[PDB]
Ligand binder design. Structure first.
Ligand SMILES: O=C(O)Cc1coc2ccccc12
Ligand SMILES: O=C(O)Cc1coc2ccccc12
Lengths: 172, 171
């Protein structure tokens, strides 16, 4: 995946977030530190926060990442789209995990109720574990795909089933 | 400890540490001019070649941090393997492959013997991280069976289209 996509993936709370543009940062709601009143040196009063279940978007009133171009954010993707989940792991290793996307779903995972776009890993069989699959520290990582000449971001990593085969992308 | 730490840059491709003393690779990526590998003189290295599969056995522990893994001669038809691809970007690309018959295949002009496979990452990579490239040769084929990782060969060849691959196997 392009270097300019990996540069937008930022360590955040108990996981990750993704810069869509100089002013717009998206993440998974449950990774946000709950008592927090300041982000990138800005008070809450100078930030527009839009929450929909496990999807959260931060819009800043100043340019936090002026090195970046604004890119396209969509509400999930067509069934059958192959996405990459942009996962960073201990030591500058980069894991763009291939996933085939399916329907919008409501599921129960480890007791909690989860809603988003379902998908199935294309990395191997029985993908439980860090080598072929996702771990809790991956939450907030972006789902991206190449559409003709450009790249699209279509959600953030929210959950994976016990077996590891099914994942859920939280969507705008 | 990770499977990924066993995948090592080697010659014009990659190889894989099965144990502290055993390294497997694709025959065509091995340097043809060398006096040593991994600091051990070639004098002290056992080399077992069967077509595009090569195994090295060292006389001392090169990777003492590792346990020995199960190495088999390919896998049952229908097994979904992962090919553990490393790229010089620092990207790690595990790709699902459905394994088929042992065969001699015509792959971009040349005859290659090994276990055929089909990538399961769909129509086209299309500049997405979904297929193999020539620099990936020697990457291992692995699958989980009960509680154990099994390694069953090395990446030898792939078609232009991308979808057919060949896994070179022991013996
Ligand atoms: O490139 C990086 O990963 C580090 C970085 C440098 O200033 C930043 C501001 C916001 C988000 C991330 C960064
Ligand atoms: O080969 C197997 O036993 C399982 C399998 C993996 O990808 C498939 C695609 C279609 C039909 C079957 C399969």
């Amino acid at each position: 995946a392009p270097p300019t996509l990996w540069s937008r993936v930022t360590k955040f709370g108990s996981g990750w977030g993704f810069w869509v543009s100089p002013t717009v940062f998206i993440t998974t709601t449950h990774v946000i530190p709950t008592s927090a009143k300041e982000f990138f040196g800005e008070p809450l009063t100078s930030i527009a926060i839009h929450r929909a279940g496990e999807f959260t978007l931060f819009r800043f009133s100043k340019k936090i990442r002026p090195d970046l171009t604004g890119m396209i954010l969509e509400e999930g993707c067509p069934e059958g789209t192959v996405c990459s989940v942009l996962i960073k792991r201990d030591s500058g290793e980069l894991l763009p995990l291939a996933v085939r996307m399916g329907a919008i779903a409501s599921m129960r995972i480890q007791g909690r109720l989860v809603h988003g776009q379902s998908g199935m890993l294309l990395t191997g069989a029985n993908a439980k574990g860090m080598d072929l699959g996702t771990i809790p520290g991956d939450c907030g990582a972006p789902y991206v795909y190449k559409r003709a000449n450009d790249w699209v971001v279509c959600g953030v990593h929210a959950a994976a089933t016990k077996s590891g085969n099914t994942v859920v992308c939280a969507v705008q």
